[PDB]
Amino acid sequence: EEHVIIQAEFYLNPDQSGEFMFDFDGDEIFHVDMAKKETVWRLEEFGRFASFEAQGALANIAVDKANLEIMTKRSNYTPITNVPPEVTVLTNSPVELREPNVLICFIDKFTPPVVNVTWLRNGKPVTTGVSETVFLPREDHLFRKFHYLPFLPSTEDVYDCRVEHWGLDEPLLKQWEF
């Protein structure tokens, strides 16, 4: 195997959440924002190199939605078994005091694709400059997701990636500090 390109989609009830995305060797090329009906490129340059008509993704999602309901009944209404996430927090480069860096919260091997993630600095939520990915596919059919927090290293700051998922009995908090 030299490379793998995967067109992955899903529809989830009763949340009525759908997703359409392409990835290359585990990295997302793009996904379609269902609300804004538009292709969202993982790296900005991709959209200057290629294109994707979002409408077609919506078409597929509609079919996925109709097939889920069909499959829900065909299975004698069998629900999914929640698999809680494995969470880790790392910086993307070695940390140097007062040198801009980025904290990455890796949320892995969980299902269904619904999760609540919050970055905490010394216990209080931080939303400044944060970002995140949509749900990425896995060979075992569970999901991956990443959250990011740019920050300025300090000897005084303590950070936590707070994660809630139906497979967890309480919020999971993974901390990191210089």
């Binding site: 195997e1 793998v4 995967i6 989830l12 499959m71 999914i80 596919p137 990443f146």
Partner: protein, 191 residues
């Protein structure tokens, strides 16, 4: 979180696997209900096959449609090879050089011992080899690697540590081999 109502999930995946560029291409289409893969279309098989009893109805219905079966059989060219070519220049050919630094761990649990750290980051693709040397002789023991970490942003990192008992004069070298560079990258730490 609240809302413990039962959830029902459906996934549709089309995997295009490429070997030696596009000389060998395989399309693996798979349907997954919750966590169970129920039906698939493997280009190496030519038709839909039920993985579990749940998918039998779809395999039958889908295999009944001849035009669908034909487009699927030619997908390896109209879909897989097509998309592979669309991004070949900025994906398969993407190459970002690692940034390598060596430093002693800020946490040393043992006197007379020095846990050395080789940080390798911001690289792409993920294929890489990191080795430690002591006076130019490869250290095959006492090495701890965090493993390959995919950052989610088309970039990778990896951390490789070396357990050492340093004696003055020794030269420790972290060597990195990656497709982005022609000759190994080396960074040394002197005892």
């Amino acid at each position: 979180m609240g809302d413990t109502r039962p959830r029902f999930l459906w996934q549709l995946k089309f995997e295009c696997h490429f070997f030696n560029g596009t000389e060998r291409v395989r399309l693996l289409e798979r349907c997954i209900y919750n966590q169970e893969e129920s039906v698939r279309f493997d280009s190496d098989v030519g038709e839909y096959r039920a993985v579990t009893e749940l998918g039998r109805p779809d395999a039958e219905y889908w295999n009944s449609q001849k035009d669908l079966l034909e487009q699927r059989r030619a997908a390896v060219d109209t879909y897989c090879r097509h998309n592979y070519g669309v991004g070949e220049s900025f994906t398969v050919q993407r190459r970002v050089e690692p940034k390598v630094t060596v430093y002693p761990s800020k946490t040393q649990p043992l006197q007379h011992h020095n846990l050395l750290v080789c940080s390798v980051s911001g690289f792409y693709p993920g294929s890489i080899e990191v080795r430690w040397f002591r006076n130019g002789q490869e250290e095959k023991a006492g090495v701890v690697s965090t493993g390959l970490i995919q950052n989610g942003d088309w970039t990778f990192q990896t951390l490789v540590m070396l357990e050492t008992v340093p004696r003055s004069g020794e030269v420790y070298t972290c060597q990195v081999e990656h497709p982005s560079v022609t000759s190994p990258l080396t960074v040394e730490w002197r005892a």
